[PDB]
Amino acid sequence: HMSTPQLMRVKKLSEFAILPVRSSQFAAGFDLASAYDYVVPARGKCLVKTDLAVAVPHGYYGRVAPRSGLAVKNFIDVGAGVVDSDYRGNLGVLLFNHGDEDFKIARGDRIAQFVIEQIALPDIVEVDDLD
Template sequence: MNFVIKAIKFLDLVIPREKRIDIASSALELFITRKMPGTAVNAVIMESAQKLVGSRQQYIGESVALRFAKLSEHATAPTRGSPLAAGFDLYSAYDYTIPSRGKEIVKTDIQIALPDGCYGRVAPRSGLAAKHFIDVGAGVIDQDYRGNVGVVLFNFSEEDFKVSKGDRIAQLICERIYLPELKEFSTLEETERGTGGFGSTGKN
């Protein structure tokens, strides 16, 4: 299966987007039947390979959509600052004043539906952080959340900071995530690091 994964990653780079799925499926079938002709395990491996290709279809052969809806007339649609920007800019739906050394939950008046297998990470905008000491907190949006997207802004400066309706306040990044099962054990295997925590690997 390592070959399968490497082949699909290669296809991501060199094959036109609309052709990748058909080519990947045909290549996998040819590889498996020639390498292991007549074996009982053929069907099982082929099924697993097809599932692997299928799970990547929305990321390879189709565009991935971040769906959103406006909850009021005050909302502004998210935008990208450039074609390859990592995140979508989020906009304030109202006017706010964030006190010095204080915080505020800034409403966007939009709700979102994230792509399958993703969560939304709300990250600071570099300009606000560098120029005005404005940072973002509580920046995780779960895939099943359908409420008003609010952004917690912290003002670490010595002056109050005004946010106007329509201002860009943060950026939303879609990140892949694993959703593992939780399993309890009586003990876990030892590692070289062991219980070394804060500062255990050095001062810097």
């Protein structure tokens, strides 16, 4: 039983996790929410747990990506964010706060989105002449 492009398997690692949910039929990403309380310090960073484990389908990876509103209004950006299809740890959201005020996060706050990006997985061939 593996994840497919139509069906992605997810496990809650605690009672505090909130399942990913897509805000509309063609929204690029699932909403991700914080499982705990955090602060993203001004000019600083914070790794936020979702307490989810996800199985992104093979042929894809999961990109943790920014919510537009928090970026435009609160100077929040997403670092790291490449979730491999065999990654089975706690799905974390690395937030950068480029503003001059701390950004407060309570459990349940939506703080990123999660896009299932289609990729190739080529092998490498070293050549002496590219073209």
